[PDB]
């Protein structure tokens, strides 16, 4: 009847071949595996919500927005008195690297970098401005602009 005993020890080996020590071994191995896969190269961008004054006179450099691959950056458009400026429309350069969403009435442009460091620019004409607003969008910086309170030079339909 030890025939039976050796059969059974043998296949407590075979059917379930990882003694439960080995199964938590593999669980932890995979844990570290895709924790390493989850690791970011270097320090990630600092999440900052900034505010900038937009200067539209000739000779001024355009506002520059820090982005990051796969992160939302929201641009809100504000007049000199701090009231919202609804957007007329926008035209983004190279949207194969950037993805922009906007509900068609509001004044919030939410942009993600679909590529790591490929930068571009974006024009946005507003309700009250004949001249639109330029912004150069650079991803992969040491900071990520979660939101930019850009302060347009003019006075909008809200005063």
């Amino acid at each position: 009847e030890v025939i039976d005993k050796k059969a059974f020890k043998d296949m407590t080996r075979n059917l379930y071949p990882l003694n439960p020590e080995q199964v938590v071994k593999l669980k932890q191995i995979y844990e570290t595996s895709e924790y390493a896969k989850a690791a970011t190269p270097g320090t990630p961008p600092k999440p900052t919500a900034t505010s900038q004054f937009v200067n539209l006179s000739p000779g001024s450099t355009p506002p520059v927005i820090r982005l990051s691959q796969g992160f939302v950056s929201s641009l809100v458009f504000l007049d000199s008195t701090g009231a919202p400026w609804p957007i007329a429309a926008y035209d983004l350069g190279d949207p194969s690297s950037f993805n922009i969403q906007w509900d068609k009435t509001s004044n919030t442009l939410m942009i993600q970098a679909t590529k790591l460091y490929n930068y571009g620019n974006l024009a946005v004409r507003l309700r009250g401005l004949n001249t639109p607003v330029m912004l150069t969008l650079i991803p992969g910086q040491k900071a990520v602009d979660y939101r930019v309170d850009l302060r347009v030079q003019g006075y909008g339909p809200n005063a």
């Binding site: 003694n19 020590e21 938590v24």
Partner: peptide
């Protein structure tokens, strides 16, 4: 840190 179900007496 201990996973005692990998237990050996």
């Amino acid at each position: 840190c201990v996973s005692m179900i990998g237990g050996s007496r």
